[PDB]
Design a protein around this ligand. Structure first.
Ligand SMILES: [K+]
Ligand SMILES: [K+]
Ligand SMILES: [K+]
Ligand SMILES: [K+]
Ligand SMILES: [K+]
Ligand SMILES: [K+]
Ligand SMILES: [Mg+2]
Ligand SMILES: [Mg+2]
Ligand SMILES: [Mg+2]
Ligand SMILES: [Mg+2]
Ligand SMILES: [Mg+2]
Ligand SMILES: [Mg+2]
Ligand SMILES: [Mg+2]
Ligand SMILES: [Mg+2]
Ligand SMILES: [Mg+2]
Ligand SMILES: [Mg+2]
Ligand SMILES: [Mg+2]
Ligand SMILES: [Mg+2]
Ligand SMILES: [Mg+2]
Ligand SMILES: [Mg+2]
Ligand SMILES: [Mg+2]
Ligand SMILES: [Mg+2]
Ligand SMILES: [Mg+2]
Ligand SMILES: [Mg+2]
Ligand SMILES: [Mg+2]
Ligand SMILES: [Mg+2]
Ligand SMILES: [Mg+2]
Ligand SMILES: [Mg+2]
Ligand SMILES: [Mg+2]
Ligand SMILES: [Mg+2]
Ligand SMILES: [Mg+2]
Ligand SMILES: [Mg+2]
Ligand SMILES: [Mg+2]
Ligand SMILES: [Mg+2]
Ligand SMILES: [Mg+2]
Ligand SMILES: [Mg+2]
Ligand SMILES: [Mg+2]
Ligand SMILES: [Mg+2]
Ligand SMILES: [Mg+2]
Ligand SMILES: [Mg+2]
Ligand SMILES: [Mg+2]
Ligand SMILES: [Mg+2]
Ligand SMILES: [Mg+2]
Ligand SMILES: [Mg+2]
Ligand SMILES: [Mg+2]
Ligand SMILES: [Mg+2]
Ligand SMILES: [Mg+2]
Ligand SMILES: [Mg+2]
Ligand SMILES: [Mg+2]
Ligand SMILES: [Mg+2]
Ligand SMILES: [Mg+2]
Ligand SMILES: [Mg+2]
Ligand SMILES: [Mg+2]
Ligand SMILES: [Mg+2]
Ligand SMILES: [Mg+2]
Ligand SMILES: [Mg+2]
Ligand SMILES: [Mg+2]
Ligand SMILES: [Mg+2]
Ligand SMILES: [Mg+2]
Ligand SMILES: [Mg+2]
Ligand SMILES: [Mg+2]
Ligand SMILES: [Mg+2]
Ligand SMILES: [Mg+2]
Ligand SMILES: [Mg+2]
Ligand SMILES: [Mg+2]
Ligand SMILES: [Mg+2]
Ligand SMILES: [Mg+2]
Ligand SMILES: [Mg+2]
Ligand SMILES: [Mg+2]
Ligand SMILES: [Mg+2]
Ligand SMILES: [Mg+2]
Ligand code: NA
Ligand code: NA
Ligand code: NA
Ligand code: NA
Ligand code: NA
Ligand code: NA
Ligand code: NA
Ligand code: NA
Ligand code: NA
Ligand code: NA
Ligand code: NA
Ligand code: NA
Ligand code: NA
Ligand code: NA
Ligand code: NA
Ligand code: NA
Ligand code: NA
Ligand code: NA
Ligand code: NA
Lengths: 74, 92, 53, 59
RNA sequence: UCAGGGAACUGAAACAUCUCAGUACCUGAAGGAGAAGAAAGAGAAUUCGAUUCCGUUAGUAGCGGCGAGCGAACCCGGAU
RNA sequence: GAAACGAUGACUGAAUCCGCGCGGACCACCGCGCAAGGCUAAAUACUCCCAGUGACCGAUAGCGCAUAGUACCGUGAGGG
RNA sequence: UGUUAUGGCGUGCCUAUUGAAGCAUGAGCCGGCGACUUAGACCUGACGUGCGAGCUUAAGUUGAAAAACGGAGGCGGAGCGAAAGCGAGUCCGAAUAGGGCGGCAUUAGUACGUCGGGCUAGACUCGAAACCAGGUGAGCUAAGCAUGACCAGGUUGAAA
RNA sequence: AACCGAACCUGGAGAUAGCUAGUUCUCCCCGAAAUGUAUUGAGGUACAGCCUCGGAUGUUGACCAUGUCCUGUAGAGCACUCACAAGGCUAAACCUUAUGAAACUCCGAAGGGGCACGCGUUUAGUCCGGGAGUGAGGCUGCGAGAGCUAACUUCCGUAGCCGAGAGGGAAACAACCCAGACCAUCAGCUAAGGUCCCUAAAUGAUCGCUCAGUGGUUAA
RNA sequence: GUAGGGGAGCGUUCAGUCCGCGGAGAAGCCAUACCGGAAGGAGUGGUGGAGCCGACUGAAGUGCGGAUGCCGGCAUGAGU
RNA sequence: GCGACUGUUUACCAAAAUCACAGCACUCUGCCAACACGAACAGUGGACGUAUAGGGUGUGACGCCUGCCCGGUGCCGGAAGGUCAAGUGGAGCGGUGCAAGCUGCGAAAUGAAGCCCCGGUGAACGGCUAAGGUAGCGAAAUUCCUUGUCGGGUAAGUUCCGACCUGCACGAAAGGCGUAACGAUCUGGGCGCUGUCUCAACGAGGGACUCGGUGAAAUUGAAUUGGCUGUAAAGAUGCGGCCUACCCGUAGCAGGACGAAAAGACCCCGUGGAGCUUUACUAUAGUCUGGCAUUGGGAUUCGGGUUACUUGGAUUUCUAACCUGAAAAAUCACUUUCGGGGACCGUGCUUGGCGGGUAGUUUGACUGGGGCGGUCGCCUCCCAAAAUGUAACGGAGGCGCCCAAAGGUCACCUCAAGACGGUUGGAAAUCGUCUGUAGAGCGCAAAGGUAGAAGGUGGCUUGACUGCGAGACUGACACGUCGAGCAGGGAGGAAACUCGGGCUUAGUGAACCGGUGGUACCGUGUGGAAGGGCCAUCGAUCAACGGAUAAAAGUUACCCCGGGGAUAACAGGCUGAUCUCCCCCGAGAGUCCAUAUCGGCGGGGAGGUUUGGCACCUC
RNA sequence: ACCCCCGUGCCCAUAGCACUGUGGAACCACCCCACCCCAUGCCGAACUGGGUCGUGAAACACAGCAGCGCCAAUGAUACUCGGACCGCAGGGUCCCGGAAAAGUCGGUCAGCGCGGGGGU
């Protein structure tokens, strides 16, 4: 059926090396793909958001469990 | 009434009672040589409005002994004029 | 949010003395009677609060 | 139009739209938490122009 | 000018209210003008003080499927 | 609409001096005013008619007409 | 300058369109007529000028080969709030979270004029089928009423 | 009363008309759009996008390199799901061999995207405010769906041109190839294309092919 | 370079002002090989028989190829 | 065949089978009739009639006749009960004041016509679930399949006649069947006759042609206006190439100039119009009805209060109002004898119902034209071409909920499956021991995600809290999403910590208007109150789901207007499924032999004559 | 400094399973008892309380082993940015760079810290 349709969104919002801020949202997902790392809190829809300022660092331990972190500048 | 106007959720309640005339503290103090306020000679102090009472508000910070005869005044204004010499007189 | 003769009924929120509305959708399916709860209004807080009207 | 007088769009210092939240208030409510107590302020930088033109004078 | 009687298109991007509008038309009566007029008023100052018209109040107060849109009066100035 | 007051058709039907009406259901207080009788310049409107004037026309304009409501069309109102 | 032979080159105009020389629209020719205006102390902006923390009158009066008088009033000047109200602060709130607003290192307005545009009027010009009011028509035509007129000649041959 | 599913005349009345037509002097500068969302909306409107003018800001623009991160397409693959060829074993499962996949993924480029910075070249962007128009696109290439892997078909993504783009080429010809017209000239070099004659330009050079008029309409 | 925005100007009528022209002759019309970046302007001649350029400034009933546009005149169809 | 007949109709394309008639039927009407015209209890028509008289409706001489079904609709009648308007009446509630008192809201009961309910009526609508075709007729003007089957007529008959039957979809007053006569009616056959034909000729006259005289019209971008082929918006005189062609007329033909005329009939579009229809919305003429005026008297019964004064409803009866008739001075005004009706009716105000007679309107959009069908919001995959995003009437499947626990917190447990072995089993399961990155589970659809849990249980509880929210994702806006921290106070845990609904992504919707609780801002002289505001919350298949109005269906071939090649039917263009034709391989038939002829399954092309697709010029 | 054991991290299969050997009072485990605190919707299996013997069998630790897993070159190819072409078409080629998957060689059954304990 050519009926129904859904715009949807999702994806990563703050990539690597990006200097974020306390409140910015990092990535929007549906499950636990990118898991909350150091200085990275996780909303109810599995959304990652920053707790302070820093540099978005990415971390891949061979797929399976992704992690994002933040290293302050100062 | 359908293009950015209505569909908006308000009402409140319209009243509009008494509007007072702001008299900046810097108008009395600072310049001028106190020619008495009262209620007639103050018309020449660039505060000509009529039909409404007069309010005294504090904005200029400067020590000077002056006397003020308006219709109503603010707390701060009263604790600002007397603090430097003077007396604010209100209708009985 | 359709409201009809069917099961469950949007139940109000009341208090002894206090005056507060939680507004919680219940149901009469299984247990439907003991809708006694506890919700602190804008008083001294911590008060006998049921949503059974 | 007199409606505009009691409609959130008052004339502020700068001259912009004073709006609220027309998400859901009275009829039809009883889900979420603070979505109800979300009666803050609204501001639009694309419909001010075509809005204050029916109340700018009667500020 | 006053009075009796009194539309519709149109507008509400449809249409029943409401607008158009007491517009148009019809009719009666009268003049060089008519209407109105000497307070069981306006109004909130224990005030002004026949009526009409002009300015202003103000497009405020207020009316309205609270929509389209409609819209006074008092104070004050002036013709008399 | 909380809807006063004026007005009117049909039923009813008050007082008058420690009186009556009103002051945006209603009540007390308070305040203004006294109907059911009449007449009455001016300031106001308009313009057939007249004079004067015009960053008004100069005849495919200007009134329709530099005269004509004629010729002409229609049974007629009417058009022209 | 005029005219002309020859060579090269060369798909009217407008409109409407994805796309026109179009076998899509318009138009015989010329002349003349013919379409973005005007109004409202209205709203908003640009420009210009006079004043300037103040800036201006309206109706009208008196004068008119000229204009002055007229400050009732409107705009500045404080904001915030549903409102009472309070005030450089006010709303939500049982005091500290934020929205709006002053101060930002810093930004004055007002009147008039011309101009861009908005609004309310017929609002750029021309154009309809239709709706409403008043009135004119049965001298054509469909009928009625009243009173009059008209139907050569021939045939068939009912009742009594 | 020569045209009646509601007469005629006058008037309301310049009725409405999201419709069709028309809209006049000149040169100079910039220069669009047929997309998104909503609409009793679909040929109409609002708002955004795109245009111009002014002011402020004044390199934040653009291309490109490096660094970093994110996305599972093409391919591929048989480890899950569906399907599937042969045989062994005793229908399934399992084993050997062999597959196909938009809604399968053990794996996984090119490229793309965000941020920082400029090792370098260049040039604009954002904000505030006045006026807009446009919201019917078209063709080709590539990547898809729909359709018979049909259509000058239709519907999306992306690049270019036409639309508003003259000039050269392709005979003629919007789109294709080459190229963006400030004005003047009996001046010169090139591109795409060609160089017997009808138009300008070697019936040019060397080594081959093709007896066909192939070139100058197609296949089993 | 279309829609569109911005800028500088030409031309016409009326108005104020200034310099003026006109019977040895205005405007208008007719011809032309000159001038200006465009809108356009000028010289000379012909016609004409009364009025009218230029400059500056103000105001508009201000610029036509179209609308099966309006009025008027004259063509084609044809000596049919 | 139809209609019986004479007759009548569309002035100007329809004379008929239309209409109309005599005849028949149903029904209404008691006479100021029913009915009708009308602003008007005036007047008039019906009718100077009055019950085989008049109005309405259907059928349509005449003959034989006219069945079955009243469930619903309509109507007539009956009517216990059920509900229902104004009004009569008044408890309670409420406001203001010191009070008297003055005042809002507001019932039980009672209350008219109707409606519901019961029955009946069909020459009323209407059917053949309330029952199902009595006679007659039958492929007939009903006919589809169909040119049906047989016979007649003809050399040959699709129509015509006669029968039969499977009557798509005949049928007894929207009458069935038949019928002499009648018919500018319709159909078939025959005779006679003929230029109607084979097949044209000859002759005449009036025009056409010539001369003299008079002298229009529609039309017209401009013209110095060929042919073939190709290109161009897709059928070329102005484009390309080639061919042909001296200049200019007259008489003639009509292929072309997508020739003229009329902004198009059809079709679509427009929130355009008009006429018409009804069980679309709504109102009204009209009509019915209760109460109240005009509008009084005498009794009985029933209601009650007051100390017979009565106040009302109903029945009854009489009259001065009122109405109507006769005679003397026809219409009346008048006095009168009187006649009858006579408190009803009529009329005025008010209530309720009925009401297409009339009036004003609504009746969506997408859409490979429109209709019909189907679809609009939200969630998940795929398409989507590795950020995001991205269409179609593209490909699949869901939601408009649920859970007092499936929440919070704190503890605790580990799945599906197979094998081996066991008893009501002998497939699965119940048990046990192994294997087992989960091949399970997570309320539902799907994807992502989850083994250290977001799988499964238990204890304690109500964070499914209030006042807020820096800073971000997302949208044009309006929405929508996520969130640390802070405050007042709570929950579980020893504690750190966590919690402001559920693994997440659907389980929903603006504004207006109103209901309920609360707080006390305003409250138009003041002090209150009504009322309004604010906090909270309730009402919505508004499903056409960013929602139009509180409230709405159809028809037009009688149609009108404004537009569109933006959009269909004809044609042409593009394509070539389908159609047509050719070709390849060859199993086999052809006694033997593939190919003298024929060519299973299957494949490759051509043409552009089919039905189409697409929508390119032309509305 | 040597080794070893125990605990706890980085690392989260090139550090995993299977097979096999070694270890015996310093440490670890099984075991014994277990009316009560506490507890398995039944069972002190596991949670848990109090501690001898024995054993190391099982589990755990270490070591050998690479049969299977896991990881995984070079070379070439698939695909592709960009540049330029061919067929009516489904499609396909050339140049210039980037560059898979699979399979093959091979590679290794870890490596790197902190703390405590007991031995030479
Ligand atoms: K033009
Ligand atoms: K200025
Ligand atoms: K549109
Ligand atoms: K003959
Ligand atoms: K002649
Ligand atoms: K054609
Ligand atoms: Mg709140
Ligand atoms: Mg009236
Ligand atoms: Mg009254
Ligand atoms: Mg004239
Ligand atoms: Mg003339
Ligand atoms: Mg051209
Ligand atoms: Mg032509
Ligand atoms: Mg043409
Ligand atoms: Mg056209
Ligand atoms: Mg006559
Ligand atoms: Mg005779
Ligand atoms: Mg006629
Ligand atoms: Mg008009
Ligand atoms: Mg209209
Ligand atoms: Mg340019
Ligand atoms: Mg809308
Ligand atoms: Mg809508
Ligand atoms: Mg716009
Ligand atoms: Mg693939
Ligand atoms: Mg579009
Ligand atoms: Mg497109
Ligand atoms: Mg196309
Ligand atoms: Mg265009
Ligand atoms: Mg050429
Ligand atoms: Mg050269
Ligand atoms: Mg070359
Ligand atoms: Mg040459
Ligand atoms: Mg050839
Ligand atoms: Mg003279
Ligand atoms: Mg003009
Ligand atoms: Mg013309
Ligand atoms: Mg023409
Ligand atoms: Mg003419
Ligand atoms: Mg001749
Ligand atoms: Mg001729
Ligand atoms: Mg001739
Ligand atoms: Mg007949
Ligand atoms: Mg006729
Ligand atoms: Mg047959
Ligand atoms: Mg025979
Ligand atoms: Mg019948
Ligand atoms: Mg006859
Ligand atoms: Mg025959
Ligand atoms: Mg002859
Ligand atoms: Mg040619
Ligand atoms: Mg030519
Ligand atoms: Mg020849
Ligand atoms: Mg002819
Ligand atoms: Mg048309
Ligand atoms: Mg039609
Ligand atoms: Mg309509
Ligand atoms: Mg209307
Ligand atoms: Mg994507
Ligand atoms: Mg992509
Ligand atoms: Mg799209
Ligand atoms: Mg509304
Ligand atoms: Mg919608
Ligand atoms: Mg509504
Ligand atoms: Mg007709
Ligand atoms: Mg038409
Ligand atoms: Mg077209
Ligand atoms: Mg046809
Ligand atoms: Mg056809
Ligand atoms: Mg066709
Ligand atoms: Mg198309
Ligand atoms: Na305010
Ligand atoms: Na509310
Ligand atoms: Na309207
Ligand atoms: Na009059
Ligand atoms: Na003249
Ligand atoms: Na009008
Ligand atoms: Na271009
Ligand atoms: Na070509
Ligand atoms: Na000249
Ligand atoms: Na009949
Ligand atoms: Na019958
Ligand atoms: Na037959
Ligand atoms: Na036969
Ligand atoms: Na020629
Ligand atoms: Na109607
Ligand atoms: Na209240
Ligand atoms: Na065809
Ligand atoms: Na390429
Ligand atoms: Na390569």
């Amino acid at each position: 059926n050519g009926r129904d349709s859904n715009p949807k969104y999702l994806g990563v919002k703050k990539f690597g090396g990006e200097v974020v801020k306390a409140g910015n949202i990092l990535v929007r997902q549906r499950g636990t793909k990118f898991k909350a790392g150091q200085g990275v809190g996780m909303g109810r829809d599995h959304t990652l958001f920053a707790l302070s300022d820093g540099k978005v660092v990415f971390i891949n331990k061979g797929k399976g469990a992704r992690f994002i972190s933040i290293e302050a500048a100062q | 009434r359908s293009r950015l106007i209505a569909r908006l959720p308000k009402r409140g309640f319209n009243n509009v009672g008494t509007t007072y005339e702001v008299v900046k503290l810097s108008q009395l103090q600072d310049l001028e040589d106190t020619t008495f306020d009262r209620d007639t000679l103050e018309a020449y102090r660039l505060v000509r409005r009529k039909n409404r009472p007069v309010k005294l508000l504090a904005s200029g910070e400067i020590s000077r002994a002056v006397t003020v005869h308006v219709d109503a005044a603010s707390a701060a204004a009263i604790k600002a004029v007397e603090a430097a010499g003077g007396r604010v007189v209100l209708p009985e | 949010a359709k409201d009809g003769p069917r099961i469950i009924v949007k139940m109000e929120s009341s208090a002894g003395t206090g005056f507060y509305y939680t507004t919680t959708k219940n149901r009469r399916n299984t247990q439907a009677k003991l809708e006694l709860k506890k919700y602190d209004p804008v008083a001294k807080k911590h008060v006998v609060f049921r949503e059974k009207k | 139009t007199h409606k505009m007088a009691k409609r959130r769009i008052k004339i502020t210092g700068t001259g912009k739209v004073m709006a609220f939240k027309s998400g859901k208030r009275h009829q039809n409510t009883g889900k979420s938490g603070d979505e109800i107590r979300g009666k803050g302020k609204g501001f639009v930088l694309a419909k001010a122009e075509w809005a204050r033109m029916k109340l700018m004078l009667p500020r």
